Design a protein around this ligand. Sequence first.
Ligand SMILES: NC(=O)C1=CN([C@@H]2O[C@H](COP(=O)(O)OP(=O)(O)OC[C@H]3O[C@@H](n4cnc5c(N)ncnc54)[C@H](OP(=O)(O)O)[C@@H]3O)[C@@H](O)[C@H]2O)C=CC1
Ligand SMILES: COc1cc(Cc2cnc(N)nc2N)cc(OC)c1OC
Length: 186
Amino acid sequence: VGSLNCIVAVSQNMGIGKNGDLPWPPLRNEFRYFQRMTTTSSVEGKQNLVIMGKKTWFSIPEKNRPLKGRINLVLSRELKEPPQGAHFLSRSLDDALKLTEQPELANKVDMVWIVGGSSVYKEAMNHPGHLKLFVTRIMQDFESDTFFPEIDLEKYKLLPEYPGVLSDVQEEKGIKYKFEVYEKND
Ligand SMILES: NC(=O)C1=CN([C@@H]2O[C@H](COP(=O)(O)OP(=O)(O)OC[C@H]3O[C@@H](n4cnc5c(N)ncnc54)[C@H](OP(=O)(O)O)[C@@H]3O)[C@@H](O)[C@H]2O)C=CC1
Ligand SMILES: COc1cc(Cc2cnc(N)nc2N)cc(OC)c1OC
């Protein structure tokens, strides 16, 4: 796999979670952006793969699990089989990417999306090679108990624009936010 993508939404105080859910109220178009980015593939015969930690998996509503139209892979050191409804289980990120090269997934995976949590993001951001970070900046402070690791600007560049990503400040339910894309190359 020659490229990874991470996708996250983060408050001004770098918060990404509180009590097993988002720190802010549900933002419907922001969620629709997450669903569009992670689901869309124009390559016939292939699907995107989403990779997440176990707490993030259990943070998804049961009726929405697995994420539809995507291959769902959970990372866990303790499980022996995927949680109920998930497609694959791997002991680490390196192992997950290697799994995509094996027969079952060989002709099947287009893009790879890391969708949390903290430790998964941290590991992905230091992975060698090309990597993009799709970061939604929620432009307020929210009480949080889980945080996004610092973006190393020695490695990552904020892109001035990106095709298919809106550049202006957005607003839903009185909360302002903006979509950012960062890239590193190694
Ligand atoms: N705002 C946002 O964009 C998002 C927010 N969230 C929020 O974040 C919180 C969940 O995230 P968080 O608490 O950080 O937990 P994680 O989703 O990272 O889950 C932690 C568990 O996942 C497994 N795991 C994590 N990394 C690895 C690894 N490298 N290799 C093997 N297993 C691994 C371990 O399971 P085990 O112990 O079984 O080995 C670990 O105990 C929730 O509040 C959720 O709502 C989540 C995603 C995005
Ligand atoms: C892991 O799956 C989900 C993750 C999120 C958090 C999230 C929300 N927005 C963006 N841009 N990235 C994210 N990772 C939000 C969700 O819905 C509100 C999810 O589905 C239940």
